[PDB]
Symmetry: C3
Subunit: 340 residues, 3 copies
């Protein structure tokens, strides 16, 4: 919601209140998404001020507030800051911002991150270039300096983040994307690579000093039709765990495929169909393991632009014999979302 | 405050900044409410969008921010999300929302929850149907489908919540209320019951597999006069602790009485008078124990609609010989509240 | 940003999104400010309602949200409530508010707290009267009841706060300030003293039962020129640590000097020059130790009123032979700030 627009500085304060609930067999510890209340909310703001007629300053902050906690000690479990950055966009040169923001490889993975609830599996947060990250300096350029419509590129610089965890840690690195949008087609390629840190190298699963991720997208988005596909691979970057040996680390290699098919009816119904398959390769002592695999059937029914509800169903293809001990049961999400 | 109302979607962003302080003898660990700085703030938003002329989507999120903490490690102590849900209200059929919201038995207890600071004693949060709860689906209906003015009812479905604590946990259950408002009178009856979970059954105090709460209210609210009374009982649901045996659990039974008497002067002064008495029965090895007992004398002086101050005094009737070790000293709250 | 002004109640909801990063040699554990991503954000609101033509109610809440955390367990590390209070300002009598607010001795230290990033060294939070504190009742009076322009005074009452930590704890005390502003000159004197608590007295470093702080300021602020100086001293109040003995407590005495020199160019550039020196005296087994010492060179370039960037450089004068083990390396901050 645009709560303010005076003296060329508009502030968009927005939020969400998602009544949500998962359904999985038993206590669902063996299910794709889990079982239980999953209600949460959001709050944030994106500001934009015009320094002049070419230069624009902008800032954004988004925060997730969990609603499925009690007002006891667990109150904060899950609350986190999702985005926080600032920048200046200028004429045709391009934009530059810095802070907690999405990694460039997300640009590609973005194409398939359209499911009602689930999906987006390979875009782990705090995992180098595929999801939200801390301290990334990003430079994007539009229409190749205005010369070519639809030709976009960006180069990101990931700063080293040595945290308490190997999972949330990352060394420094660089990445970049290139996308061309035309008619209702989009084609993307993005890649990045950064140093793994000592703690990361110290983990039992995964071996290397350089983690690199890359993926490409293709999409036909026009005339109530959304079709998109993603494919990517990674070296020592997808976090994994062996539930049996109680070991953790990263998959040495992974072949990722994401597919989406969605149609937007006029009356508000927007069914969804998708396929997700992530397979780790060269996992020590195991070899090839499916980290994710399933089919999705879903439907979001938008009332107006500030209301909707959706049902998401995950036909979990993962089998019980999974080596890493991944869950094999299905999950069903049922949400009702109010926003502004 | 209504910061936005465009295209039939009004957003009410509100808050509080309560400068507060308690006064009790000594360090007050033996006092009703404690002693010290109790300053806090609130922030939230309730949105409402008109899907059409019968259907309305709405959402709400409220968060408590504690101000009596240092900026050190204790910073977050007390911060919690108080409410978070979403729903659709429709024509005369009624409303339906889901998320973190008040339990139906609160509908009754609401009548007496009007004190300047204290009061509301029996409406514990995260305690089945008497206070705020997680994952409750609620259906309310107004004026009996519009047929009878003042006749209201609601049926709530409490979802199972297996948390780290027995106190904050709850099995699944159902509850409902019925209220009739007329002239300036109100009469309410509400009841609910749900399964106690293993962890709860596992506690030393309290025995049963089903916890059920119920209460009724009566109130005369009109012409600057507010008079209300509540009475209820519970089976294995009111959380209790024996400070001496260092044991916890739930009271097998409790007889609750709440009484309020308040008058609204024209110039802003609104004195308060109240009586609260909660007694546990069948407490193992003890029998009958008063969990709460006192008289209250208070007064809120509202300047305008965004300012007030109040003094609340609790004449603590609990004696020193209390078996469960409940505090016996008095407490005085003195707040100054700004809001919007 | 003033998101609302109706019926004489204006609400100013504001925020920040600071993309920030420190630069120090090595991992910088021996540097002044540290090394790494330091991105954060702010959110808050100050409200003001006119009770009538003399009386005004007002409230404020400010919260710091850290952006340099991962979305993992460390998510909340650093989030804190910075301010939270409420009051009534009246005619010429003066204002009175209560809650989490700045201590009076800050009034003096304020003069030198103008650096782009660093600076303000001696105004520790949760440290009696020099920084933000919990439960302080403050009374300020303007222009000596309107009789003398520029003559201002305030008397603060610090409530006892017995927290988990000696550092964040404080006994009760009183403080007050006196400031006279004229032409573009300002002269301030402020002082306070309060009881140290048992836990504080219990610490190895620092001996006394009464902690007292005081400081004075002088400033020439007019015609794009800002020049300010501060000098103060303290008894058993500045928190200190001996990195080698792994001991903590408070400096028995400290001589603090702060100096600032800044000029505001018309086009937006605002260079900064400053000197900071805090020296502890009578530190057990050591004697005199510099807690802080350096020169600063900085520059903030404001685009418009909602955008800026700055570079701050700390020429760290602290030597390696520091007895308390204080860091000796330099630090460089580079921020880009969007606000509203």
């Amino acid at each position: 919601a645009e709560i303010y627009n005076k003296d060329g500085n508009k502030v968009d304060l927005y939020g969400k209140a998602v009544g949500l609930h998962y359904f999985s067999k038993g206590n669902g510890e063996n299910s794709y998404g889990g079982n239980g209340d999953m209600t949460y909310a959001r709050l944030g703001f994106k500001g934009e001020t015009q320094i002049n007629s070419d230069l624009t300053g902008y800032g954004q902050w988004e925060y997730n507030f969990q609603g499925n906690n009690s007002e006891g000690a667990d109150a904060q479990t899950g609350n986190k800051t999702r985005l926080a950055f600032a920048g200046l966009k200028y004429a045709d040169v391009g934009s530059f911002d810095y802070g907690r923001n999405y990694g460039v490889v997300y640009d590609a993975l973005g194409y398939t991150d359209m499911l009602p609830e689930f999906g987006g599996d390979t875009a782990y947060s705090d995992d180098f270039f595929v999801g939200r990250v801390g301290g990334v300096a990003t430079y994007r350029n539009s229409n190749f300096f205005g010369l070519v419509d639809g030709l976009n590129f960006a180069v990101q610089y990931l700063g080293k983040n040595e945290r308490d965890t190997a999972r949330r840690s990352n060394g420094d690195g660089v990445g970049g994307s290139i996308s061309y949008e035309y008619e209702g087609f989009g084609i993307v390629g993005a890649y990045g690579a950064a140093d793994r840190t000592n703690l990361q190298e110290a983990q039992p699963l995964g071996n290397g000093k350089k983690a690199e991720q890359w993926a490409t997208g293709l999409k036909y988005d026009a005339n109530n039709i959304y079709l998109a596909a993603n494919y990517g691979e990674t070296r020592n970057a997808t976090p994994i765990t062996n539930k049996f040996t109680n070991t953790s680390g990263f998959a040495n290699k992974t072949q990722d495929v994401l597919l989406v098919a969605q149609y937007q009816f006029d009356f508000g119904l927007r069914p969804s169909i998708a396929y997700t398959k992530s397979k780790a390769k060269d996992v020590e002592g195991i070899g090839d393991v499916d980290l994710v695999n399933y089919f999705e059937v879903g439907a979001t029914y938008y009332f107006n632009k500030n209301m909707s509800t959706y049902v998401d169903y995950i036909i979990n293809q993962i089998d019980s014999d999974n080596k890493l001990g991944v869950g094999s049961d299905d999950t069903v999400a049922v949400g009702i979302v109010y926003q502004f």
